[PDB]
């Protein structure tokens, strides 16, 4: 009949699809390119801007911009280009026919939701929509009603404790560390070894290096002692021009800055200490049930060994007599989408949508009272 669209804007990848199917059928980077060189050949069909995988294919000749930075949409016309491309090109569905479900990080400005709703109603003319919290959807995705979700995409990291379906909004922690600034750190440490990656395309090469070769050390000092004392840890990667580059302690040393943000120069504690300091803000009767479920979400939690490092140092911080259990399903990169796909298909949820009648009556202000 009619099936809601489910869209998660993220930073980096857009992933989108229809409610009640199990994985997104559109996935592509939320990136817009504009050509920067003088075009020479007449009659080429040359185009004003490129979106998604087009801008990845041609990225040699493009300036690449991300329209979302730390979960805040900074540039709105490019975000409208990304949604226009998503609905018409990727899904090939007319948005007037389908409710749309949209996903956001907690504690980000309200103007972002007001503009997202004004755009979805006025330009797209979407009949109904909703804005959902990224972390809440990872519980729907992992089959739980209780747990402290740790979520990290590109941009924002946040912890959200939930207990039997009640959020605890005073205990929500948010951190801007994750994912892009790891790449801007890797580009800085790789220069030490004599490699220089400046352009926005070279940043995409370093992002691919990070996704292939980085891993998290169980003990950071033992492994720096080992990699100073050996070649055994060292891996080599082939650049798109067929050069070959060799990467040593940098590969474990890059994601350690998740646990020691002072490397990039932040003043806040690592994700393990924001997790523990988030559990410490919950009332003592429920802490046992948060230690028994920790749910990792989003791509920045994909590094090998990040679960066992998290469990090791949280088990160091926690009182000795409790199970600490870290839950990290291999699919977790899509968990926020799978959770929104579940949520949008419930029958109880069909009264939750903001309808255009209500937007017309109350204006975009309504989103704050109706949505979370």
């Amino acid at each position: 009949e009619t099936t809601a669209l489910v869209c998660d804007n993220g930073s980096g990848l857009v992933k989108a699809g229809f409610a009640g199917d199990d994985a997104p059928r559109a996935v592509f980077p939320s990136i817009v390119g504009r050509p920067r060189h003088q075009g020479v050949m007449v009659g080429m069909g040359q185009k004003d801007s490129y979106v998604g995988d087009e801008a990845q294919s041609k990225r040699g000749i493009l300036t690449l911009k991300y329209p979302i930075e730390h979960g805040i949409i900074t540039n709105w016309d490019d975000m409208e280009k990304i949604w226009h491309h998503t609905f018409y090109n990727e899904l090939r569905v007319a948005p007037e026919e389908h409710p749309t479900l949209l996903t956001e990080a907690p504690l980000n400005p309200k103007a972002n939701r007001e503009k997202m709703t004004q755009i979805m109603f006025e330009t797209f003319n979407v009949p109904a929509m909703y804005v959902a919290i990224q972390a809440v959807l990872s519980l729907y995705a992992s089959g739980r009603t209780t747990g402290i979700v740790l979520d990290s995409g590109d941009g924002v990291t946040h912890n959200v404790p939930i207990y039997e379906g009640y959020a605890l909004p005073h205990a929500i922690m948010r951190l801007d560390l994750a994912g892009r600034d790891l790449t801007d750190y890797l580009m800085k440490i790789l220069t030490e070894r004599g490699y220089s990656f400046v352009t926005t395309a070279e940043r995409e090469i370093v992002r691919d290096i990070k996704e292939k070769l980085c891993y998290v050390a169980l003990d950071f000092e033992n492994e720096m002692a080992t990699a100073a004392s050996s070649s055994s840890l060292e891996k080599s990667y082939e650049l798109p021009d067929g050069q070959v580059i060799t990467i040593g302690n940098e590969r474990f040393r890059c994601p350690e800055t998740l646990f020691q943000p002072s490397f990039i120069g932040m003043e806040s504690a690592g994700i393990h200490e924001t997790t523990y300091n988030s559990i410490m803000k919950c009332d003592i009767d429920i802490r046992k049930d948060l230690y028994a479920n920790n749910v990792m979400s989003g791509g920045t939690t994909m590094y090998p060994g990040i679960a066992d490092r998290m469990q090791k140092e949280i088990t160091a911080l926690a009182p000795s007599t409790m199970k600490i259990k870290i839950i990290a399903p291999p699919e977790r990169k899509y968990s926020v989408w799978i959770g929104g796909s579940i949520l949008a298909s419930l029958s109880t949820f069909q009264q939750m949508w903001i309808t255009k009648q209500e937007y017309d009556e109350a204006g975009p202000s309504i989103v704050h009272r109706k949505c979370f």
């Binding site: 070894r193 004599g194 490699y195 220089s196 990656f197 400046v198 070279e202 650049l239 050069q243 580059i245």
Partner: peptide, 7 residues
């Protein structure tokens, strides 16, 4: 250099 730039 050894990758990006020529030196």
């Amino acid at each position: 250099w050894x990758a990006x730039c020529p030196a």
